[PDB]
Design a protein around this ligand. Structure first.
Ligand SMILES: Cc1cc2nc3c(=O)[nH]c(=O)nc-3n(C[C@H](O)[C@H](O)[C@H](O)COP(=O)(O)O)c2cc1C
Length: 140
């Protein structure tokens, strides 16, 4: 089974150098994901991560277990795991997306002015993933 797994987490602010942490996370993620048949997107804004992992169920669940142990975030909240009929994020071992006015417009239009993916219902999380898919990747 191929699956998409999504979660949200909090930036651990004990870590002072966020810019280097994001570089390190994306370096590690792109290396491992490429070697293990995983793709997806990492969204970062307002001290919170949202990630979607796509790939074979066992490798994706194993990677999510490893990510839970990572001291660069805390308060990991699993949002969904479902089987997928297409790999939407196959262009990227790990796409990087930051907040932009289109994503802010998306949240405002559906009434969620916190811009917090953790608050989205199943349908709105699918729409949020669409925004992350069409967003121009942020070059790190
Ligand atoms: C928000 C976030 C997202 C991450 N995404 C991935 C990823 O997609 N793939 C990956 O291999 N590592 C990712 N990591 C990194 C792993 O958690 C990190 O490389 C791992 O802790 C190294 O584990 P090890 O010491 O067992 O090698 C991520 C880390 C964070 C904080």
């Amino acid at each position: 089974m191929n699956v998409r797994l999504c979660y949200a987490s909090q930036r651990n602010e004990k870590n002072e150098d966020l810019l280097q942490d994001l570089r390190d996370i994306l370096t590690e993620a792109r290396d491992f994901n490429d070697l293990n048949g995983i793709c997806g997107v990492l969204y970062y804004a307002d001290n919170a991560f949202f990630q979607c992992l796509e790939g074979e169920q066992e490798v994706v669940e194993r990677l999510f277990e490893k990510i839970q142990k990572d001291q660069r975030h805390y308060n990991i909240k699993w949002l969904c795991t479902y089987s997928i009929d297409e790999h939407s994020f196959q262009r990227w071992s790990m796409k990087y997306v930051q907040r932009n006015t289109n994503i802010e417009t998306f949240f405002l239009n559906m009434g969620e002015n916190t811009f917090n993916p953790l608050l989205l219902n199943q349908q709105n999380l699918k729409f949020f993933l669409n925004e992350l898919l069409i967003a121009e990747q942020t070059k790190m």
